[PDB]
Amino acid sequence: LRQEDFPPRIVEHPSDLIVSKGEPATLNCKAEGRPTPTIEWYKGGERVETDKDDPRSHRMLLPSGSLFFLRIVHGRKSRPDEGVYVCVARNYLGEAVSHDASLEVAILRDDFRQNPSDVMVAVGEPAVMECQPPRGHPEPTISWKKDGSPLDDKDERITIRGGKLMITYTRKSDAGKYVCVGTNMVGERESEVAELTVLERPSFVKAA
Ligand SMILES: [Hg+2]
Ligand SMILES: [Hg+2]
């Protein structure tokens, strides 16, 4: 047995990650060298600031070389965590750079861009309701509920298209409470209840 000295070598590379805003996240990376290479991380070719640079920071450089995020920060006016990462190991002999890992963030807001509205329709005519759900990543898919049950378009007179719900050949049983639901991997969001009133011609002339 002896002692030695050698240029930096990466054994474990970071892996692509999908995490939601506010969750903790780890990007793994472990090196070998003699020293004892100082580890560094780069997002889109900028040094990542951690608890060794600023002691208040939400990121920690773990002794293992993994980058650990106390919480993924990601909002309207700042998203400083998502992006493409590389760990770089170094001593006086050399340098090892790892493969790219992308940190992608899943988010769903609470602000509905537009709630559906009460609508009044006359029996036999078509009715239209409108929804645009909050922003999201990925963008949420839109379903609807009537009177508390999911709504479905295996039923021939119900069409769901983009933002709009359309019921054709209205009858009295369509009158109810309609809510619009936007959903992605992070969760679901519910709109304000809109109310459909369906009236006979005579009292449609009266109300309208
Ligand atoms: Hg209800
Ligand atoms: Hg209710």
Curated annotation (Swiss-Prot):
Coiled coil: none annotated. Ubiquitinated. May be deubiquitinated by USP33. Glycans are attached at D100. Widely expressed, with exception of kidney. It is found in: Cell membrane; Cell projection, Axon; Endoplasmic reticulum-Golgi intermediate compartment membrane. Disulfide bonds join C29-C87, C131-C180. It is linked to Neurooculorenal syndrome: An autosomal recessive syndrome characterized by variable clinical features including congenital renal anomalies, neurodevelopmental defects, intellectual impairment, cardiac defects, and ocular anomalies. Some affected individuals present in utero with renal agenesis and structural brain abnormalities incompatible with life. Nystagmus 8, congenital, autosomal recessive: A form of nystagmus, a condition defined as conjugated, spontaneous and involuntary ocular oscillations that appear at birth or during the first three months of life. Other associated features may include mildly decreased visual acuity, strabismus, astigmatism, and occasionally head nodding. NYS8 patients manifest bilateral horizontal nystagmus in the absence of other neurologic signs or symptoms. Brain imaging is normal. Receptor for SLIT1 and SLIT2 that mediates cellular responses to molecular guidance cues in cellular migration, including axonal navigation at the ventral midline of the neural tube and projection of axons to different regions during neuronal development. Interaction with the intracellular domain of FLRT3 mediates axon attraction towards cells expressing NTN1. In axon growth cones, the silencing of the attractive effect of NTN1 by SLIT2 may require the formation of a ROBO1-DCC complex. Maps within a region of overlapping homozygous deletions characterized in both small cell lung cancer cell lines (SCLC) and in a breast cancer cell line. The promoter region of ROBO1 shows complete hypermethylation of CpG sites in the BT-20 breast tumor cell lines, some primary invasive breast carcinomasa and some primary clear cell renal cell carcinomas (CC-RCC). This is Roundabout homolog 1. It comes from Homo sapiens. The chain holds residues 61 to 266 of 1651 of the full protein.
